[PDB]
Structures are given as structure tokens and as C-alpha cells.
Design an enzyme around this catalytic site. Structure first.
Site, PDB file in Angstrom:
ATOM      1  N   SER B 141       0.852  -1.197   0.000  1.00 47.80           N
ATOM      2  CA  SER B 141       0.000   0.000   0.000  1.00 47.80           C
ATOM      3  C   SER B 141       0.883   1.240   0.000  1.00 47.80           C
ATOM      4  O   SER B 141       2.043   1.177   0.431  1.00 47.80           O
ATOM      5  CB  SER B 141      -0.846  -0.004   1.275  1.00 47.80           C
ATOM      6  OG  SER B 141      -1.531   1.204   1.506  1.00 47.80           O
ATOM      7  N   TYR B 154      -1.386  -2.232  10.547  1.00 44.93           N
ATOM      8  CA  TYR B 154      -1.595  -2.429   9.117  1.00 44.93           C
ATOM      9  C   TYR B 154      -0.394  -1.915   8.287  1.00 44.93           C
ATOM     10  O   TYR B 154       0.141  -2.619   7.423  1.00 44.93           O
ATOM     11  CB  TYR B 154      -2.884  -1.746   8.671  1.00 44.93           C
ATOM     12  CG  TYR B 154      -3.151  -1.782   7.189  1.00 44.93           C
ATOM     13  CD1 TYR B 154      -3.751  -2.882   6.594  1.00 44.93           C
ATOM     14  CD2 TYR B 154      -2.809  -0.724   6.377  1.00 44.93           C
ATOM     15  CE1 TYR B 154      -4.024  -2.910   5.222  1.00 44.93           C
ATOM     16  CE2 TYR B 154      -3.040  -0.750   5.010  1.00 44.93           C
ATOM     17  CZ  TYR B 154      -3.665  -1.835   4.438  1.00 44.93           C
ATOM     18  OH  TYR B 154      -3.888  -1.868   3.073  1.00 44.93           O
TER      19      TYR B 154
HETATM   20  N1  LIG Z   1      -8.757  -0.867  -0.907  1.00 37.40           N
HETATM   21  C1  LIG Z   1      -7.723  -0.175  -0.466  1.00 37.40           C
HETATM   22  O1  LIG Z   1      -7.849   0.931   0.017  1.00 37.40           O
HETATM   23  C2  LIG Z   1      -6.367  -0.796  -0.531  1.00 37.40           C
HETATM   24  C3  LIG Z   1      -5.261  -0.019  -0.816  1.00 37.40           C
HETATM   25  C4  LIG Z   1      -4.024  -0.632  -0.871  1.00 37.40           C
HETATM   26  C5  LIG Z   1      -3.932  -1.997  -0.660  1.00 37.40           C
HETATM   27  N2  LIG Z   1      -5.024  -2.724  -0.423  1.00 37.40           N
HETATM   28  C6  LIG Z   1      -4.881  -4.154  -0.201  1.00 37.40           C
HETATM   29  O2  LIG Z   1      -5.959  -4.911  -0.730  1.00 37.40           O
HETATM   30  C7  LIG Z   1      -5.961  -6.160  -0.050  1.00 37.40           C
HETATM   31  C8  LIG Z   1      -7.358  -6.770  -0.011  1.00 37.40           C
HETATM   32  O3  LIG Z   1      -8.351  -5.827   0.362  1.00 37.40           O
HETATM   33  P1  LIG Z   1      -9.506  -5.381  -0.657  1.00 37.40           P
HETATM   34  O4  LIG Z   1      -9.433  -3.892  -0.690  1.00 37.40           O
HETATM   35  O5  LIG Z   1      -9.395  -6.120  -1.948  1.00 37.40           O
HETATM   36  O6  LIG Z   1     -10.897  -5.766   0.058  1.00 37.40           O
HETATM   37  P2  LIG Z   1     -11.469  -7.232   0.406  1.00 37.40           P
HETATM   38  O7  LIG Z   1     -11.438  -7.447   1.884  1.00 37.40           O
HETATM   39  O8  LIG Z   1     -12.772  -7.350  -0.312  1.00 37.40           O
HETATM   40  O9  LIG Z   1     -10.490  -8.251  -0.331  1.00 37.40           O
HETATM   41  C9  LIG Z   1      -9.675  -9.136   0.420  1.00 37.40           C
HETATM   42  C10 LIG Z   1      -9.859 -10.562  -0.069  1.00 37.40           C
HETATM   43  O10 LIG Z   1      -8.842 -11.381   0.499  1.00 37.40           O
HETATM   44  C11 LIG Z   1      -9.441 -12.457   1.208  1.00 37.40           C
HETATM   45  N3  LIG Z   1      -8.711 -12.780   2.448  1.00 37.40           N
HETATM   46  C12 LIG Z   1      -8.622 -12.014   3.544  1.00 37.40           C
HETATM   47  N4  LIG Z   1      -7.892 -12.625   4.501  1.00 37.40           N
HETATM   48  C13 LIG Z   1      -7.507 -13.814   4.017  1.00 37.40           C
HETATM   49  C14 LIG Z   1      -6.714 -14.961   4.501  1.00 37.40           C
HETATM   50  N5  LIG Z   1      -6.166 -14.963   5.732  1.00 37.40           N
HETATM   51  N6  LIG Z   1      -6.556 -16.006   3.672  1.00 37.40           N
HETATM   52  C15 LIG Z   1      -7.089 -16.023   2.444  1.00 37.40           C
HETATM   53  N7  LIG Z   1      -7.818 -15.023   1.939  1.00 37.40           N
HETATM   54  C16 LIG Z   1      -8.058 -13.914   2.665  1.00 37.40           C
HETATM   55  C17 LIG Z   1     -10.846 -12.011   1.548  1.00 37.40           C
HETATM   56  O11 LIG Z   1     -11.727 -13.123   1.645  1.00 37.40           O
HETATM   57  C18 LIG Z   1     -11.197 -11.112   0.390  1.00 37.40           C
HETATM   58  O12 LIG Z   1     -11.779 -11.877  -0.659  1.00 37.40           O
HETATM   59  C19 LIG Z   1      -5.319  -5.921   1.311  1.00 37.40           C
HETATM   60  O13 LIG Z   1      -4.175  -6.757   1.430  1.00 37.40           O
HETATM   61  C20 LIG Z   1      -4.834  -4.492   1.276  1.00 37.40           C
HETATM   62  O14 LIG Z   1      -3.514  -4.389   1.798  1.00 37.40           O
HETATM   63  C21 LIG Z   1      -6.225  -2.160  -0.344  1.00 37.40           C
END
Ligand SMILES: NC(=O)c1ccc[n+]([C@@H]2O[C@H](COP(=O)([O-])OP(=O)(O)OC[C@H]3O[C@@H](n4cnc5c(N)ncnc54)[C@H](O)[C@@H]3O)[C@@H](O)[C@H]2O)c1
Ligand SMILES: NC(=O)c1ccc[n+]([C@@H]2O[C@H](COP(=O)([O-])OP(=O)(O)OC[C@H]3O[C@@H](n4cnc5c(N)ncnc54)[C@H](O)[C@@H]3O)[C@@H](O)[C@H]2O)c1
Ligand SMILES: [Mg+2]
Ligand SMILES: [Mg+2]
Lengths: 258, 265
Positions: B141, B154
Site C-alpha cells: 500500500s 496495518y
Molecule cells: N482498498 C484499499 O484501500 C487498498 C489499498 C491498498 C492496498 N489494499 C490491499 O488490498 C488487499 C485486499 O483488500 P480489498 O481492498 O481487496 O478488500 P477485500 O477485503 O474485499 O479483499 C480481500 C480478499 O482477500 C481475502 N482474504 C482475507 N484474509 C484472508 C486470509 N487470511 N486467507 C485467504 N484469503 C483472505 C478475503 O476473503 C477477500 O476476498 C489488502 O491486502 C490491502 O492491503 C487495499
């Protein structure tokens, strides 16, 4: 200098942390609590004796254990009644055990830092204070032989810089500082080649192991006490060749979009 | 659902691929003509994948329910994937959570999951072990680059991911394995990660500061970020770090932090 101050030191039974504990006492610290897994009992007996007008308390606790640490801090606060200084040094190198590395090196720092705050903050009755977290140069500039260890070191920096925000400071009066030392002759590197992820990089370990004599645990500890005197919130210091180098961290420069 | 040729004949694994960003990565890979796509997630989202399979009848879509924190589980999962797919060309490690009130979980999932997945994939990708080489993209991130004070735990895990990933991109490793390592660092993105955000922060007295994040959620979508990720894959540049903001990809030129210019003090 550090006279009349109460201090806690994780990893304070050995290496760098031991020297921090020793030097704090030699600098006149009123009370020093040591949190460590190892007992080093014969060593603490003579240390008490050398500082008969100063409290020296040792608690055997794994810094990975969140509730354990919480409990430990409770015990310290009963005796000490206040906490001015925390130096979180505890850490291991063992890239073959990812979970342990993460929970000790990164979780330990966090567990200790977070458990201390209620006993230090201006809110909740404390007088404020300072927390120094042990990172590494490799947390700043990745070192390819040791990716898991390094990751935990980078995390510590990010964690510690966050807590130093003005928002927190005005309320708590607690300051947050990170130190990033280079190679240092300590037991952390014992059997180093046995603990690296990629065996075919055993011929590259010299890059670290040949520099161990360039500074000692005592040297690093002196630099740390120096960092404490500076008492500058949000600061990051490199400790190399027995000297302290303040870093001015600038945000990352971004090229034109592809 | 037109199928392109961008990633034609490629086998891909995507952690966190059942939802948010990862889901869109899975969808878009298939739309870009990927031969086979394996999803590693806690959830299976069959209703979404049944339809996706139907729209891509000549392409394999495999879902395995596994916690990325579980080292042996992930290892086992990778074995299953390699037996079925037969080879692995692309890994996109997206899985992650926000929950600073659960330190251990955050650490083990966000940082340990990336590591477990990355390390478990290497034997099946490396040229030194019969693989054809490939690419791993790790989800960090922007907060991993520049700390964001509301979310220290985080953020720590995000910083760690960068350091970890840049290490593996050393020429020493590349010559032997032919595997490339890339990190992406997106800004705020409207996803389920921000559901009940303010209740999950460490310091309750910073709840009045969460707007700083939550007001930026509309500048880019999960689909937008995913498009940028596919764009990163096409660039295929070892050791690269990219920022993803306002639907655009920004290559970072990283200069070392420790230099001899500092004076002793
Ligand atoms: N949306 C943002 O603002 C943002 C910005 C930068 C990085 N991210 C990254 O995006 C990633 C995922 O978040 P998202 O925004 O897609 O929302 P989200 O929570 O919908 O997506 C996360 C997905 O990963 C799966 N998951 C979570 N924990 C898990 C585990 N222990 N084992 C297997 N699967 C698991 C969840 O089931 C979900 O499908 C995070 O790692 C985060 O660091 C998000
Ligand atoms: N030695 C170096 O080259 C170097 C350089 C920079 C930073 N560091 C940091 O210094 C720390 C290591 O100290 P050292 O180099 O003196 O090594 P050391 O092994 O001499 O000391 C580490 C001490 O921490 C204690 N400890 C380890 N795990 C623990 C746990 N889970 N709970 C409680 N106590 C625990 C050990 O008992 C030991 O006494 C690490 O955090 C490392 O990141 C070391
Ligand atoms: Mg030692
Ligand atoms: Mg999530």
C-alpha cells in the site's frame, strides 16, 4: 542525566539490551525493569550489587505473548508507579521460522510499545516519556540474504513513525524514536548460515559476518543513550561504526504515469 | 465476454481472489486470455465463479479455500494447483485484512500470507527446478511507503511486504530462477476492507481523523486498481515498485535511505 528515571528494556538480559540496561544504571537511572526470555541470573546478582541504591527488576516473559506482556507491564507499574523510558530491543534472526520471526520481532515491539502507553501518557495520570524501537539498517535498505527479518525491521520503522504523530503527542506527551544499527557482534548471528532461507546464498553471508567487529553491543548501546538525550520525536537514527547518524526521511519520488 | 490474448496460455494464482481487488484481478486475467486461474481465498464465491466459468468455457477457474497465514495449508494448496495446472507463470498476492485491534492476525495474514504464498510458489516457477520462470506481484500500500498515523499495525505489514519483495528481486536469485518480483502500492480504494473501519482502529480518539482515508475512497475502484495491476504485469520489470492512485500507475525510482552524507551526532 537519566537520574531519577524509570526504564523498561525488552531483550535486556543479553547483547545490546544488556548493555542498555547496564549503561542506564551507570547513568544513574532510578529503576530498570528487564523483560527477556533468558534468565542470566548470575549476571543480574552482580548487577544489583554494583547498583545497591537502584532497583533492578527481571521478568521472564516472551514478548510475542500479548497478554503476558500486558500482565508484565502491570507488575512493573505496581512497583515502579511510573514509566519514563522504554527501549524495545528484543528480537531474533531465524528466517526459516517465519511465524516466530514475525511474532517476536514485529509483534514483540508492538506488544511492548502498546502495553507501555497507559502507564506513560499525560492522559491517564502519567508524565509522558520516550519509546525507542530497535529496527535495523536493513529495514531501511533491504538486504537480499535476509528477506523475512528485514521485512520485520521495515515494519518497526513504519509502526514507530506513526505513533510519533503530533495528534498523539499533544495528548500523551510520549515520544517515539527508531534506531537502525548496522552489523554488531552479538549472539544473534550465531549459526547464521544455518538459518537463512536460500542455502545457495551461504557464500554471500560474509557480507554481514565480516563486519561484526566494526562495532560492539556496548558501542551501539552508547549511541542509544545518546539518542535518548536528544529526545526528538519521530526521529530515525542509523548506528554504524560506533556512531549515530540522524536521518532526514523524505517521501518517495514518483515517475510519470505509464 | 471477449477473450483477449495479452496473457494467452498463462497460468496464474491469485490470493484474495474471491473479492474486492483480487476478484477483479481474477476476472480481468481471464478476460485478457489467461489459460488457467487459481484462486486462494477464505471464501469461495461460487455464484460469481459459476458464471465466470460459463463465460470462459475454454479456461480453467479453480478455487481452493485456504487461510494464507497457514504455512502448511498454503504449501499443500500450491501442490494441488501444480498437479492440476501443471505449471505456474504468474502469482498475484492480494490477500489482506484491516483490523489493527487484532495484531497477531494482521501480522500473520498480511505479512505472513504474502511470504507463505511467495515462498510456496518458487519451487514450481523456478528455472532451476524445471519451471519456466515467471513473475510475482505483491500487494503493499502507499501507507507502506509513507506512514499513515491512524493505522500503524496495518502499515507496518505493508512496509514489510515492500522490503521482503525487493530482496527477492536480487540479480543473484533471478539468474538462477528466472522469477521476477514486483510490488504495487495502491492508494485508498472503495472495497469491503473499509467496512466498519472506525471500530477497528487502535486509538478510539483518532476516529475523528478517519475521514482522511474514508473521503478518498471514491477516486478509484477495485476494477481500476486491477487494470493497473495487469498493466504492471505487462511491464514485467524485476524489482520495480509501483504506486496506484487515481486509476493510474506510477513507477517509483527508489533511492537508498542510508547514505554517507549524514553527519555523526
Ligand atoms: N482498498 C484499499 O484501500 C487498498 C489499498 C491498498 C492496498 N489494499 C490491499 O488490498 C488487499 C485486499 O483488500 P480489498 O481492498 O481487496 O478488500 P477485500 O477485503 O474485499 O479483499 C480481500 C480478499 O482477500 C481475502 N482474504 C482475507 N484474509 C484472508 C486470509 N487470511 N486467507 C485467504 N484469503 C483472505 C478475503 O476473503 C477477500 O476476498 C489488502 O491486502 C490491502 O492491503 C487495499
Ligand atoms: N546484532 C546486530 O547486528 C543488530 C543490528 C541491528 C539491530 N539489531 C537488533 O537487535 C536485536 C537483537 O539483539 P542482539 O543483536 O544483542 O542479539 P542477542 O541475541 O544478543 O540479544 C537478543 C536478546 O533478546 C532476547 N529475546 C529474544 N527473543 C525474545 C522474546 N520472544 N521475548 C523476550 N526476549 C527475547 C534474548 O533472550 C536475547 O537476550 C534484534 O531486535 C535485532 O533486530 C541487531
Ligand atoms: Mg549477545
Ligand atoms: Mg480485507
Amino acid at each position: 542525566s537519566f537520574r531519577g528515571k524509570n526504564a523498561v528494556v525488552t531483550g535486556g538480559a543479553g547483547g545490546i539490551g544488556l548493555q542498555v540496561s547496564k549503561q542506564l544504571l551507570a547513568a544513574g537511572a532510578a529503576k530498570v525493569a528487564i523483560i527477556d526470555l533468558q534468565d542470566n541470573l548470575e549476571e543480574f546478582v552482580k548487577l544489583r550489587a554494583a547498583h545497591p541504591t537502584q532497583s533492578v527488576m527481571i521478568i521472564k516473559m516472551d514478548v510475542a505473548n500479548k497478554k503476558g506482556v500486558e500482565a508484565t507491564y502491570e507488575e512493573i507499574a505496581k512497583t515502579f508507579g511510573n514509566i519514563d523510558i522504554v527501549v524495545n530491543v528484543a528480537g531474533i534472526f531465524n528466517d526459516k521460522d517465519v511465524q516466530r520471526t514475525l511474532l517476536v520481532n514485529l509483534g514483540g515491539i508492538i506488544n511492548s510499545t502498546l502495553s507501555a502507553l497507559p502507564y506513560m501518557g499525560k492522559d491517564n495520570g502519567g508524565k509522558g516519556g520516550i519509546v525507542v524501537n530497535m529496527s535495523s539498517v536493513v529495514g531501511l535498505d533491504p538486504m537480499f540474504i535476509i528477506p523475512v527479518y528485514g521485512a520485520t525491521k521495515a515494519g518497526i520503522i513504519n509502526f514507530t513513525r506513526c505513533l510519533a504523530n503530533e495528534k498523539y503527542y499533544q495528548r500523551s506527551g510520549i515520544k517515539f524514536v527508531t534506531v537502525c544499527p548496522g552489523a554488531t557482534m552479538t549472539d544473534m548471528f550465531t549459526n547464521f548460515t544455518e538459518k537463512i532461507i536460500f542455502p545457495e546464498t551461504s557464500d554471500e553471508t560474509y557480507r554481514i559476518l565480516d563486519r561484526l567487529n566494526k562495532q560492539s553491543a556496548a558501542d551501539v548501546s552508547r549511541c542509544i543513550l545518546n539518542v535518548l538525550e536528544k529526545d526528538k520525536n519521530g526521529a530515525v537514527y542509523v548506528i554504524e561504526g560506533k556512531r549515530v547518524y540522524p536521518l532526514e526521511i523524505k517521501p518517495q519520488w514518483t515517475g510519470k504515469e505509464q
